[PDB]
Amino acid sequence: VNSFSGYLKLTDNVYIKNADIVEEAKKVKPTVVVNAANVYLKHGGGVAGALNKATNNAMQVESDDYIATNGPLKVGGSCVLSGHNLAKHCLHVVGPNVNKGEDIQLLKSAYENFNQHEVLLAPLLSAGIFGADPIHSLRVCVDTVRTNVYLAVFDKNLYDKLVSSFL
Numbered sequence: 001v002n003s004f005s006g007y008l009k010l011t012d013n014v015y016i017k018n019a020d021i022v023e024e025a026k027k028v029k030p031t032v033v034v035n036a037a038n039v040y041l042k043h044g045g046g047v048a049g050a051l052n053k054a055t056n057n058a059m060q061v062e063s064d065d066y067i068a069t070n071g072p073l074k075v076g077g078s079c080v081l082s083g084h085n086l087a088k089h090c091l092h093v094v095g096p097n098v099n100k101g102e103d104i105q106l107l108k109s110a111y112e113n114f115n116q117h118e119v120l121l122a123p124l125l126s127a128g129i130f131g132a133d134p135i136h137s138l139r140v141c142v143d144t145v146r147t148n149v150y151l152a153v154f155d156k157n158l159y160d161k162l163v164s165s166f167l
C-alpha cells in the first residue's frame with residue numbers, strides 16, 4: 001500500500017491521473033519524482049521549469065554543480081539528484097526532443113531508467129514541449145517500465161484522450 005490517490009489503473013504496474021506533477025509531489029512526497037530533463041539539466045520550461053520553480057531554483061543550483069563536475073547527460077540517460085521539497089530524490093531523465101530531431105527510438109532507453117526504482121511519480125517522457133506523441137509515449141511506458149509508475153498528466157483533455165485510446 002502506498003499514498004497515491006485517485007489514479008486509474010492501466011496495467012499491473014502503471015497508473016495514470018490528471019494532475020499537476022508539482023502539486024502531486026508536494027502532497028505525496030514520493031521517494032522518486034521524475035523530471036523531464038534535457039542533457040544540460042537546464043530546467044527552463046515544461047515539467048522541468050515547473051519542478052525547478054517549485055524548489056525556488058535549488059534544483060537548478062544543484063544541477064549546475066552536477067554538470068560542472070560530470071558534463072552533460074546522454075539522450076536516453078538519467079541521473080539521481082535531490083528531490084528538494086518535492087520528493088526524496090529526483091530522477092532526471094532525458095527523453096528525445098523531437099523539436100531537436102532526436103531519434104524517437106531513444107524513448108524506450110529513457111523509460112528503462114525507471115526500472116531502477118521500485119515506485120515513481122512521473123510525467124510522460126518526450127511529451128509536451130519535447131514534441132512526441134503522448135499516446136506513443138504511454139505505449140512505450142507500459143511496454144518498458146516494470147516497476148510501479150504513477151503518471152501525472154497536466155492537461156485534462158489529453159488525460160481523457162490517453163485513457164479513451166488506451167489498448
Ligand SMILES: O=C(O)[C@]1(F)CN(c2ncnc3[nH]c4ccccc4c23)CC12CCC2
Pocket residue numbers: 019020021022036045046047048050123124125126127128129130131152153154
Ligand atoms: O514540458 C512538457 O513538455 C510537458 F508536456 C509538461 N508536462 C507536465 N506534466 C505533468 N505535470 C506538469 N506540470 C507542469 C507545469 C508547468 C509546465 C508543465 C507541466 C507538466 C509533461 C511534459 C514533460 C514532457 C512532457
